[PDB]
């Protein structure tokens, strides 16, 4: 159906996302069990990590477009990522390495993430109709990798240990790099402008220097989440002031605040919803025993099933409003499952978590996938920067919100943890329903301003 480089990009993206989600799925449990963090420390540390992973994505588009070229930056990102995974594996011998290792994944992801999609859009003549379907298949690539990693990495880490899990993340990046090198012949005339001049060693060295400095800055911020909190607070207040000094822009600002709320909620899947599954859900579905950490795989699962359907089925403000209502219902469903449908022992049916993740995945399909592509219609570089900044702030806020469900290590009774989860998830659901309603109320004004 598609050009030959499409299949290359599809499989490279699949394997890189497999490595990343291999780490994401096990990381909070690794903090608690392997490093002995309390749940509170593990949740805010995960929030800082994810804030860096997501905020740094802006660097890689610039580096790919203007310094080194898209294809060279794919190679460099994949190598830094692989090194970061093998470093995380080595942190089990050398525990003092963990934060440097996570910084290396973050910087690596920052260099890599934007560039495969950019490459993909250059595989098609400019207004080729196959573009939409190819980008839907690209999203599905990401979620197939995510589904495999979130399903299997917890099982692997339990049977064989963490060093093996992280080294297989490493190995996934290595085979992504092998697939890319084997298929390089396919993209020889595809690239950004620096891809076709000789490589500038001055700029390559500047990129390496900046990368290493950022690896160390990330490590520091993740080890001291309070200064990271204040850094993002002053950066947000300040970038907000410089945005409020300099109509279709105000629309992008309200849509950004709504994206912020969405990502606060998305941040709960590896933290508070993960430990909710661990503590208060039956670990058996359809007669099979599973690792409860694997329940995270229900998000890519429902995306893979639902992204065809929803691709084959107002406009932007209403699509955002709908996504927000779906997220609200996901959390209200978790709360209702805990308030009314639990066993005498304090455990709930896994079908309720299946439904929670369905709602959350639908919200994802309506919001995060459809976000910056019609913020790219409302608009540039400053706004893209601020977009990733507020996304990072959302992950930091999400880690802080997760701490309200944190369980002390000595609690062993599910009837003690169930009400903590149900109070926090119920209040999240109600706040998010309120926000969805105010969004609905503002949809006509927003549509008129877009016009």
């Amino acid at each position, epitope marked *: 159906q598609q050009p030959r480089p499409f299949f290359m990009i599809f499989f490279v993206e699949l394997w890189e996302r497999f490595g990343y989600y291999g780490v994401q799925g096990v990381l909070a449990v690794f903090f608690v069990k392997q490093l002995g963090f309390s749940q509170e420390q593990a949740f805010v540390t995960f929030g800082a990590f994810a804030a860096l992973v997501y905020g740094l994505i802006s660097i890689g588009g610039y580096v790919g477009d203007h310094l080194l070229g898209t294809k060279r930056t794919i190679v460099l990102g994949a190598l830094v990522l692989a090194i970061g995974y093998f470093m995380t594996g080595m942190s089990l011998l050398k525990p003092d390495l963990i934060f440097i290792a996570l910084g290396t994944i973050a910087v690596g992801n920052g260099l890599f993430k934007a560039n495969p999609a950019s490459l993909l859009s250059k595989c098609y003549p400019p207004k080729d109709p196959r573009l939409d379907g190819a980008f839907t298949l690209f999203y599905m690539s990401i979620n197939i990798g995510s589904l495999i990693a979130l399903s299997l990495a917890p099982v692997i880490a*339990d049977r064989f240990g963490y060093s093996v899990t992280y080294n297989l993340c490493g190995a996934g990046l290595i085979i992504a790099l092998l697939v890319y090198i084997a298929c390089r012949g396919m993209v020889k005339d595809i690239g950004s402008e620096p891809d076709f001049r000789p490589m500038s060693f001055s700029k390559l060295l500047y990129v390496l220097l900046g990368s290493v400095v950022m690896i160390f800055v990330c490590a520091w911020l993740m080890h001291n989440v309070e200064v990271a909190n204040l850094v993002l607070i002053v950066l947000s207040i300040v970038v907000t002031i410089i945005f409020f000094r300099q109509n279709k822009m105000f629309v992008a600002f309200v849509l950004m605040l709504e994206a912020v709320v969405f990502y606060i909620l998305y941040a709960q899947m590896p933290t508070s919803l993960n430990f909710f599954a661990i*503590n208060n859900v039956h*670990h058996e579905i359809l007669g099979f025993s599973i690792n409860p950490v694997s329940f995270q795989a229900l998000n890519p699962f429902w995306v893979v099933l639902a992204s065809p359907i929803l691709a084959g089925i107002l406009s932007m403000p209403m699509k955002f409003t709908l996504g927000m209502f779906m997220c609200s219902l996901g959390f209200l469903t978790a709360a209702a499952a805990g308030m009314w449908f639990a066993d005498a*022992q304090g455990l709930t049916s896994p079908w309720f978590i299946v439904l929670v993740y369905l709602f959350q995945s639908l919200g994802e399909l309506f919001i995060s996938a459809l976000g910056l592509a019609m913020i790219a219609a409302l608009v540039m570089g400053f706004i893209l920067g601020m977009w990733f900044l507020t996304q990072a702030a959302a992950f930091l806020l999400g880690g802080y919100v997760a701490t309200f469900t944190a369980v002390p*290590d000595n609690i062993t009774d*599910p009837l003690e943890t169930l009400p903590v989860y149900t109070n926090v998830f119920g209040k999240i659901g109600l706040v998010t329903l309120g926000v969805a309603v105010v969004m609905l109320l503002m949809v006509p004004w927003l549509k008129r301003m877009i016009a």
Partner: nanobody
Amino acid sequence: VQLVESGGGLVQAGGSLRLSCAASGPTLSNYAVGWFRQAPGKEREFVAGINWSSGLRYKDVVKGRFTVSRDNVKDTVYLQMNSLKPEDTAVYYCAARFGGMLPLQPSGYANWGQGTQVTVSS
């Protein structure tokens, strides 16, 4: 995923026994291990357990007599039973649940040992 219990047997009132539970491929260290017991003519009931981070839970009638503990190097969980009484007679099972929770009922646990007979004689 398969637990092996050892240590049962026959003892007189006021004596002591020590059960042990070991797992095979999965590392028991990620698991809360609960000890259940079934006396003749009754249901499996929760006796004692340790979660994955040293939290402990006990049935009221064994407090101050039984101690659960964990050797994370040998990957073993132990149940030390002192001041045994005749009504402690039962088949004892270890059960494993991923995480920090020790639910009271057998359905909260997916992995089960085969059971060891403990008999306490007057």
